[PDB]
């Protein structure tokens, strides 16, 4: 029931293959739905549910907004190149901003900026102030807080306009967000120097949250467990692996345990 909308902006001074001058991706609960880049110069969908937006002007309006960010971000990169007395070359400007809707119906909002892969400035939307990282960041923090309007305007977007759209996106995408795909699990192993390595692998589970671990006679072997990070598939599903080293003899003793919203009760798997 909690949800998020988040936009990821990336602007570079020197493009490279697969890295346009400016990219914007928007995600509904960590899944892409809208895309804009400086090459195509237009808003395109990344999800099919997007066909029900019914604003009519939506795609053209957001294209003009992206084209604005594209112009402005160029200017920001020049602002900061000169502010930090850097020379012309490869520089990176990134921004992430969006809203969350929590389990209790509460809202959060974010607007954080980075330059060269490091924190630059970020909005604290409840005090209407900014957290600057540098003396360079502070120049902007002063200009933004003296004028006194940018913080107010962003907080209004995150708390109203953003949430208002989130609720609609979540409704238009219910069949995608509310679906469930069970993991395909397989235990595999191989003997090294008298050490059996057990590998448990969950394939194509949706949604993202998952629990995986080894049990030796039903006792959790957490200290000796090597569990990977959740990684994406190309269809919107996820992948995870958990490994354990055992003694070749105590082999029957050991089971993999996968717990996931798609399975009414724990799945148990053995080599």
């Amino acid at each position: 029931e909690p949800h998020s909308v988040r936009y990821f902006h990336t602007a570079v001074s020197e493009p490279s293959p697969g890295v346009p001058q400016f990219v914007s991706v928007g995600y509904l609960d960590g899944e892409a739905f809208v895309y804009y880049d400086s090459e195509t110069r237009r808003k395109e969908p990344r999800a099919d549910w997007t066909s029900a937006i019914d604003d009519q002007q939506y795609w053209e309006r957001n294209t003009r907004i992206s084209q604005n960010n594209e112009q402005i971000y160029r200017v920001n990169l020049e602002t900061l190149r000169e502010r930090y007395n850097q020379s012309r070359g490869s520089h990176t400007w990134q921004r992430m901003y969006g809203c969350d809707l929590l389990e209790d119906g509460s809202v959060r909002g974010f607007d954080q900026y980075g330059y060269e892969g490091r924190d630059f400035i970020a909005l604290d939307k409840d005090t209407r102030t900014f957290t600057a990282a540098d003396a360079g960041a502070q120049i902007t923090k002063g200009k933004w807080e003296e004028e006194g309007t940018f913080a107010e305007t962003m907080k209004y977007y995150l708390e109203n306009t953003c949430i208002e759209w989130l609720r609609k996106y979540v409704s238009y995408g219910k069949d995608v967000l509310e679906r469930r795909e069970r993991p395909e699990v397989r235990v595999s192993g191989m003997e090294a120097d008298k050490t059996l390595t057990l590998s448990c692998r969950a394939h194509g589970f949706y949604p993202r949250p998952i629990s995986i671990g080894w049990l030796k006679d039903g006792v959790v072997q957490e200290q000796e467990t090597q569990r990977g990070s959740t990684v994406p598939n190309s269809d919107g599903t996820y992948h995870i692996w958990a490994t354990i080293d055992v003694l070749p003899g105590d082999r029957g003793k050991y089971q993999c345990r996968v717990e996931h919203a798609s399975l009414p009760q724990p799945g148990l798997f053995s080599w």
């Binding site: 914007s24 907004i65 920001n76 306009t161 759209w165």
Partner: peptide, 9 residues
């Protein structure tokens, strides 16, 4: 929908 106001530093 993205925000209309531009962020200039």
């Amino acid at each position: 929908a993205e925000a209309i106001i531009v962020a200039m530093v």
